[model samples]
Target: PLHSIISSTESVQGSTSKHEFQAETKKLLDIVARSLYSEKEVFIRELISNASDALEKLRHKLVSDGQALPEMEIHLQTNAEKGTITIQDTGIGMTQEELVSNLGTIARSGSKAFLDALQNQAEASSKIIGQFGVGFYSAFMVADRVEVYSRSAAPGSLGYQWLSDGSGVFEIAEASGVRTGTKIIIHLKSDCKEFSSEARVRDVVTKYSNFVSFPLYLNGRRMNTLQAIWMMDPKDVGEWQHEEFYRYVAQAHDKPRYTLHYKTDAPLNIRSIFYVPDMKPSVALYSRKVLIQTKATDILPKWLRFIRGVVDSEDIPLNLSRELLQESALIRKLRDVLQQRLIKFFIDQSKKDAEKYAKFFEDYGLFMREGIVTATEQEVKEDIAKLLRYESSALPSGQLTSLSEYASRMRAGTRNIYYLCAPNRHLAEHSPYYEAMKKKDTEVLFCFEQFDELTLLHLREFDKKKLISVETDIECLSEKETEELMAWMRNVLGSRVTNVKVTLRLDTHPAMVTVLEMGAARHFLRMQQLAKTQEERAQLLQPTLEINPRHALIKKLNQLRASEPGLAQLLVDQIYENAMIAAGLVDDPRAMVGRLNELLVKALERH
Candidate 1:
């Protein structure tokens, strides 16, 4: 015969029995059931997590003392006939007294703080839910009635049975033949009978409890086999391990091109592993809230869409169900911290392994450039700009340099950073827009993409220097020299060149063609033939041409002004057209072909 312990003190001598819950218990239970957790199914995850925690504690004890325990596994059993779902774990179970105390009353957990957080900060409510440790009562949301059966891990303690409907009271009694761990049996509401299905239960288990540090079985099948590898030290993780981890998280077979594993304890405790996958999914195929999907945009920054990884931080505030993040100042700080760290990692990698970093840039550089243009944070934008690499006027086509490196080589008295925008390096080198700057031996940044101009336009300056395009009309030459050169070139070229001036910056190239204003040439070309009249379409803005006054071509052109004005005019128009092509202002090359043919015929005839 087994001994039975009743709920009343009269039946159990020398024991003061506690029956009903305190006043606050009912209100808290109501909150958990109605408002605390967004999804009722999360209750299953909460209970499973609790069971896993118990098993982990038992396992830790066994490892420390070499004590032998029963098989350590979690079991899920659902009986559709009885409309009941049972979660059993081989863990450190509770005694009758422990059951009475743990289940019969409200455990304030973080209730007061949670209530205060709710009152003081709306955003803190979600974060404080799971932080309180009372996630167990979330079960009341779906369960009409709940029962717990357990025997103490201690050899002599009696088994306990705790039953509750989560109204305001619970009943506790002694029972026999209970296992050394707890089993929770939920009597599902009619609508919640779906939880009694093995498939439904397995889905819930895989989602929230799949990473629990214990073996879990759904209907006698093993689940939660995947590990949270991000929690491990980066030193112990290898390239192969990272690859495997990335595949698991990203759900892709492609290799990871970039891996970033870092741990931080300050500001907020964070352990993260990030990867840039070689493949990308289309935006149309992306689903925001779908379960079991591989890609989630919210996991990383929008610009970091290429990354796939896990980020676990103890400081991360989760809502009651742990399914969503709480918007908190701490979260913003964490985002900033992670973003800066990633940028710094790339910067360091660029220095350590230039070839590998360049490969990364080839694939993801567009995003960084977009960030430099669109990000509102000046510091973040500048940091992103540091990752920009391009062909320099001073370097060969394949050679690339950073903005900081270009700034470091700037000559004294150089107040502006010069850049040339073109379709590619081949065209950039021959661009008439860069002629004056190249002659001056000034290194100009090469931009090859269409958005490159807009990116630099938005980022007007970097490293305390203004970003100026070489196609702009502002002459770097002194006022007096510009005046003399302007008069001489105007006299020589006649109507071909709108304006001509000496350039203070020109050192090698004979002349530089500049539009009257920045971006005006490109806009003018785009507006061509769209206007009602020819004057409206070809509206020449009287460009200012800056010539290297000391160059032989200009000296000869000055001499030719008096010797042969017609040929000089042809040369001047050719120079202007060449400059327009370089400036990306020339839409059609047909107009230049006729003039080029004329020049060739004249030169042939003279020969």
Candidate 2:
């Protein structure tokens, strides 16, 4: 457009044009230097982005026509002694008219949108910045003087030079031997000596411009060796390429567990490659191949904090600092889209390789549990629930099964999906709660983590079936043989238990405690910070002591209550405390310590 506007007027090669800035230009330059960018070193990033944008423009130009053109590349030169740095791009260049309009003026030509964005709000500014325009003035952050040499690719276009000290005036003169591209030479300020170091400049380039679409050179040496793989088709990207990229981005040596190369045009024009690393998760955000935010926190849910990879989208609106993704309706949509896609991708992975996914689940299953607990929607909760795997009563130890698998295996007319939370397989099997259901054919899911019960409690249901904890699901001893014993035990337990019942469910254990909703007790424990007294804790737990009247201890205890009444009182107290401990209700066992010693002393005296 600039070339077309200037094509009619440029003829003499030796002529020069002098121009004055729109008085507002000086204030803008100061803002760009002082307020816009967070760091002074980002000036290098700004210039390189401009050159890449110009190169991309030329790349689009040669798409239809096959004429020979300059190599699309970016080059940088740092001269420490002279305190100067140069950035050049072999792409679309500027004519005298284009120079006057773009560099000699402000709030016109390429960056009018960016200027108007400042008036409206900071939200739209991210959209304009991602287009990579209006950043040339950023060079003044470190430069004492700036010079631009360019030659338009338009026919009969002559080379020209634009120079300025960021003052109210600038000069554009016809120059010889200027290539058909743009080159910026910056005379670095005395205070900004670091930019003049080749190492310093390379570090900045690698941080921000390492994935630029065009080739980049530093002092005649090729610098940008990695490709922007997110832009490439998924099938074309090799595993080795992913390995190198993963190590570069994750800074870890282990290979990724899963790599999701997701490209979609409909919802948001998203191009992202998310890697489930063997170690941790972090995602870098890029806009059109240039880095915008590293370790982006807002794009993905907190439960997905283990996913590591790069997300490059042209549509994501960014803040002025470019460090944060702006909170907008569109951004929330992007988050939802990514989360569901990731969930589906994980589900697909499980079907692709069951054994491999089992290993992945073993390492990262906690996050899935966390997701299920924290999810606000029932659909999303179930979506995350699909990834949950647990040891089952029907399956061998360490062999995991999902909720869907468990649901499918459920017996006809079984309304509840039962799960028991314990520390391990042995504890779960030994649990009196498990003892009550072992006689039945219904399979029970065994959850071994400390948080598993809480997570399942929060999830509540899946596929219309309620998630019931075995501790809460109840049964051992029954009838006339235990009728008076139940009343005696209730008299002993007093305020500690709400009731004492003869249950016919147990086959081995003497007695066990039960709660109406065991999950509620755990939630209470967490809310109280685990510091509530026994009396206070019992008020909420309202536990019931279920006695196995058929067991030998119960028959012996019944006789002892009528004969050695004082010892029977100690025995009943001990039995109640033991059952309370098994039910996860007792926080301290110190009260039983002296009682246990007294029982030992009584037995020793008889000896």
Candidate 3:
């Protein structure tokens, strides 16, 4: 079914012919180092990865094809004085023809037409063998001069010497004193002399190739003893095993709070282990054993940035240098699957332990909130929203409730889910918003964080119940008396209020404001407040001032207006401001301090 790609054993006699490289071959070194790879330090890992791949290939051949092979290994030798770094691999080596085809040609793929059009650097790089797959080509990044010595594992194979200046041209000839595998000698540039040191080489290998399945020898010393525990069976992994892996990946002393050992094959072949660290941890991204990026957010949703761990997918398609992944539909599907899996995981975790989950929420609630608030689809929004927890008026202080539970407990006739945003529980209870809902059977969710209400606004509805903010509820006056007083107050406040109206929405609370879309109003106000764009915000914050006719302040102020003009105006301004505060409409409470001080002094003075 298959034929070997190897050439005839007949060697080209004294093959020292000079052939011109493809056009723009000089730019190969430049793009490979700077543009293709984000960090050239990965060149070390790339080299090691290729070596391991070769060893595997040899192992496969030895069993199936009965090819001669040695004990698979990788060796490192550095010379600071000569400014050269040499990495020797005991794996499948190349013949003279193989060396020319593999090394002499810059980036030769199957199609000649593909090779002809070297115009598009990015597209060209992906198609090229040297950029993503061929690690032998990466030596030019650190070296001005590169040399390769190889002896093929096949019988009657002659040794070959391959040398390159790394710009445009290369030479390959018959050679002696070559071993069974490949050895690369890199004449490191002065600027890249760091690679010539044993310490630098060892650090690079230790980081990226730590989990690699081979004994790595650096200057005759063994390294990378720790196994990749993520690949092991979850049931077999002990508590300390996860801790060790988490500490290794997260690079911290504290163990993982929770380890998610997840492997999926339905959507795509994906293996990932997410770590919830006690402290901050930087996430490591990899693709099919190749480390892609540190603190990589592209692999996971932005909300999961707090989590640290590894996500390795065989399905991830890479570009040049393996520096970036192609933005594909498969990637989007993978992300969706991962997000859902995590949301489900959290839901399960919550059911397992209420107290434990609450504590987790106390630390990681922002991420779940982010997932809910940022989601665009109704299905996704609801899925993320299920993970959210809120303190309700029905729940005692220090108690929390989920949306599902809240919906289950809600009255049968109630169609609207209610909520109020405040600084804390104490403020939430005493606020005008709460006062309005005091007599109602509806239980309002108490939101402390600034973003909580915004999250609900994004969600809009959950479990068939409409999400409604207490601040936006409008209960208008039907009677002429209440309506007339509202009109009178509207004339007094003028432009300060949009339209004055009396309401049955409040019991003890005097007055409040209502906007058509409370969520957008608050968000705009917050944005304006943050950027100090007062002119834009002033227009948005203008709201209809609703008054409770039964309140003492409204009645007293209405009667006192004719007798005491200044007193009625002062009382009206204070009532409007206090109501604005309850409605989450005011940016600065300090603006009221001076007005309050004036009222306080005037009250204290006996006249």
Best by lDDT: 2
lDDT of 2 by residue, 83-158 (tens): 8999999877888778887776654445333335356433333233334334777788888789999997777788
The segments of candidate 1 whose C-alpha lies over 4 angstroms from its true place after superposition are 1-27, 61-66, 107-131, 280-302, 315-329, 373-377, 426-432, 471-607
Per-candidate TM-scores read: 0.68, 0.72, 0.70
Question: On a 0 to 1 TM-score scale, where does candidate 2 land against the true structure?
Answer: 0.72
lDDT, each prediction: 0.69, 0.78, 0.72
Estimate candidate 3's alpha-carbon lDDT, on a 0 to 1 scale: 0.72
Model with the higher lDDT, candidate 1 or 2: 2
Candidate 2: residue pairs that collide = 281-306, 476-503, 476-504, 476-505, 477-503
lDDT of 3 by residue, 1-607 (tens): 8888887878667968899855666686566655666666777787777666556546655765665556788887888899887778876788877777766665642223333444544332222222333455677778888888888887778788888876778878778989888888889876898898888888888778776666778888778787666656767778887877887787777877777888866886667888887763146766656566667677678887777788766457666666546466667887788888878887898898888778888687777778887777888899888888889998899988998999888899878899887655754675556767778777999887667866888899998888998888843333775666666677777766778766675788898776654445546556634664433544655666777877888767656677777777777888987987776666577767788889767655565
For candidate 1, give the lDDT of residue 490. Answer: 75
Worst 10 residues of 1 by lDDT: 282-291
Candidate that would win on TM-score? 2
What's the C-alpha lDDT at position 119 in model 1?
A: 56
